Write a protein that binds this ligand. Structure first.
Ligand SMILES: O=C(NNC(=O)c1ccc(CNS(=O)(=O)c2ccc(F)c(Cl)c2)cc1)c1ccccc1
Ligand SMILES: N[C@@H](CCC(=O)O)C(=O)O
Lengths: 280, 286
């Protein structure tokens, strides 16, 4: 009961991957764990039902190790109110919101540590290196976010077309550091990573700006290997994915020491090769 | 109260120079034209192991000093900087049944220091005893060799299956030392390095130039700076294990949350990258 925790997550491969629980069988296969997802009956009601699904991935594997080592059980569910977390009219949604408003004891996934989030929740040590990278077609010459094609887009004819996925930690950072770039970008907003990668390969987009760890994963599995990160590898606003906890959580230092232990004894690097080995 | 800051000599994060005749720091400038922010730091001059350690005022500057200055102005505190007395980062050792910390770790716990500002690696062992900030630098481990030396990296048979023919080493009582001592599959390498470990990074680096050491395993943030600065040295194999540097504090510290928030802010608003551009590397090689 005290060691049975409400935990929230969000789908973003290869860190969190959601699979339909198959019928007839009722169970979740060997390497996956149960996760539930609140699905609405209709749009003229508040009525809904929790659909049982199955979750796997890097962060889920991390969650299992923590569950063993720190000794707790959990009820994992998928966020439905927004995604990773955005402050809207001074109110947090997404995974950050679920923790802030105490519907979840912790949040696990591709959750980026930044300053404004650290004000309303406690973060574990970073367990996945990330930040802001730029994905382009191979050969494209851009220094990075600080390149003047991004900073002052209309100084070029035709203007460089680049965009991000809104409402995440990447957009928050650009809005604060590069006001002109940001208000220029908005017209090239993408609904998600998949859309953006399609826009790149068909020439409708020149660059895609996003989370480094996800972009690096997608570069290594691109067909033709002509979609690369601009570094290639270097990162702006270096930070990490972290486990989000309620402010002053009693689980914090145990989770921290556990994650650091995983790093030191080789378990972390093996999860990397298991989930994030590419071809390119 | 005034924060006792302990640091350690480690270029390009901490440079350590003699004061001038009058006891002041020479006014110098950076590569980009900016003035170098220097502070007075007391510390021993004689570095011999097992020798008396008389402290003299000296001049410190660099990446970590600029960070300290920023942190001091941001959170409104005053500081006294001194160099760690035994010149070590810090490990935990049996004495003997009892165990103790040495290096900067020891000084932070004994109360000789209130804060560690240094390229100090975050790991499980240290985190049990002290509080780390969020990392102010993401890096890893790599290998420094002399140019012309050819090894694949950490899995090279001359490392995994060692002899006196090819000597490699790290720094005594460091996080890299802890790293190879803990993991049992690295045991063969640990027993080789244990015969050859150097007292400081500078000495090990000089030893590689002097063909007295064939491979030096250490922080890549440091080794890559040296290889860019000294063209007779190169790094090979690149990062084989990621690690980060954090600010060290006792678990009691009232500054720890606001220090970490300040770190996060500096990553996000480009201040850390300005420091990297200023201090970490900007030169060559071919
Ligand atoms: O960063 C990844 N794994 N994490 C580590 O190897 C790791 C995690 C924690 C620590 C503990 N020290 S830390 O907080 O200062 C740190 C340093 C470097 C890092 F990259 C991270 Cl995430 C954390 C060290 C290495 C990673 C995994 C898969 C794909 C891309 C990156
Ligand atoms: N990882 C990001 C989402 C993707 C992005 O904004 O780059 C976050 O936690 O908000």
């Amino acid at each position: 009961d005290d060691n049975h925790l409400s935990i929230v997550t969000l789908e973003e491969a290869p860190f969190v991957i959601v699979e339909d629980i198959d019928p007839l069988t009722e169970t979740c296969v060997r390497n996956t764990v149960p996760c539930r997802k609140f699905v609405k009956i209709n749009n003229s009601t508040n009525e809904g039902m929790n659909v049982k699904k199955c979750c796997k991935g890097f962060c889920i594997d991390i969650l299992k190790k923590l569950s063993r080592t720190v000794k707790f059980t959990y009820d994992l569910y998928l966020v439905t109110n927004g995604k990773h977390g955005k402050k809207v009219n001074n109110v947090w949604n997404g995974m950050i919101g679920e923790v802030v408003y105490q519907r979840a004891v912790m949040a696990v996934g591709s959750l980026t540590i930044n300053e404004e989030r650290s004000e309303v929740v406690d973060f574990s040590v970073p367990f996945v290196e990330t930040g802001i990278s730029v994905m382009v077609s191979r050969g494209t010459q851009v220094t990075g976010l600080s390149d003047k094609k991004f900073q002052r887009p209309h100084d070029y004819s035709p203007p460089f077309r680049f965009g991000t996925v809104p409402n995440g930690s990447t957009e928050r950072n650009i809005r604060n550091n590069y006001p002109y770039m940001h208000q220029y970008m908005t017209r090239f907003n993408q609904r998600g990573v998949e859309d953006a990668l399609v826009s790149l390969k068909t020439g409708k987009l020149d660059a895609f700006i996003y989370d480094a760890a996800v972009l690096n994963y997608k570069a290594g599995r691109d067909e033709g290997c002509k979609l690369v990160t601009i570094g290639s590898g270097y990162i702006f606003a270096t930070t990490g994915y972290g486990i989000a906890l309620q402010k002053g959580s009693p689980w914090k230092r145990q989770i921290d020491l556990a994650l650091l232990q995983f790093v030191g004894d080789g378990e972390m690097e093996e999860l990397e090769t298991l989930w994030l080995t590419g071809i390119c | 109260t005034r924060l006792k800051i302990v640091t350690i000599h480690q270029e390009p994060f901490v440079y350590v120079k003699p004061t001038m005749s009058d006891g002041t720091c020479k006014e110098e400038f950076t590569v980009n034209g900016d003035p170098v922010k220097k502070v007075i730091c007391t510390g021993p001059n004689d570095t011999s192991p097992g020798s008396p350690r008389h402290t003299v005022p000296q001049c410190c500057y660099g990446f970590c000093i600029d960070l300290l200055i920023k942190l001091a102005r941001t959170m409104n505190f005053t500081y006294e900087v001194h160099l760690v007395a035994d010149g070590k980062f810090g490990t935990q050792e049996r004495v003997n049944n009892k165990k103790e910390w040495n290096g900067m770790m020891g000084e932070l716990l004994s109360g000789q220091a209130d804060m560690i500002v240094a390229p100090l690696t975050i790991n499980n062992e240290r985190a049990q005893y002290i509080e780390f900030s969020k990392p102010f630098k993401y890096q890893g481990l790599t290998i420094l060799v002399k140019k012309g030396t050819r090894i694949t990296g950490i899995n090279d048979p001359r490392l995994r299956n060692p002899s006196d023919k090819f000597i490699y080493a790290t720094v005594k009582q460091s996080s890299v030392d802890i790293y190879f001592r803990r993991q049992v599959e690295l045991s063969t390498m640990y027993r080789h390095m244990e015969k050859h470990n150097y007292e400081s990074a500078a000495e090990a680096i000089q030893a590689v130039r002097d063909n007295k050491l064939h491979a030096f395993i250490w922080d890549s943030a440091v080794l890559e700076f040296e290889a860019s600065q000294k063209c007779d040295l190169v790094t090979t194999g690149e990062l084989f294990f990621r690690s980060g540097f954090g600010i060290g504090m006792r678990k009691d510290s009232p500054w720890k949350q606001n220090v970490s928030l300040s770190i996060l802010k500096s990553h996000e608003n480009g201040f850390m990258e300005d420091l990297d551009k200023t201090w970490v590397r900007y030169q060559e090689c071919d």
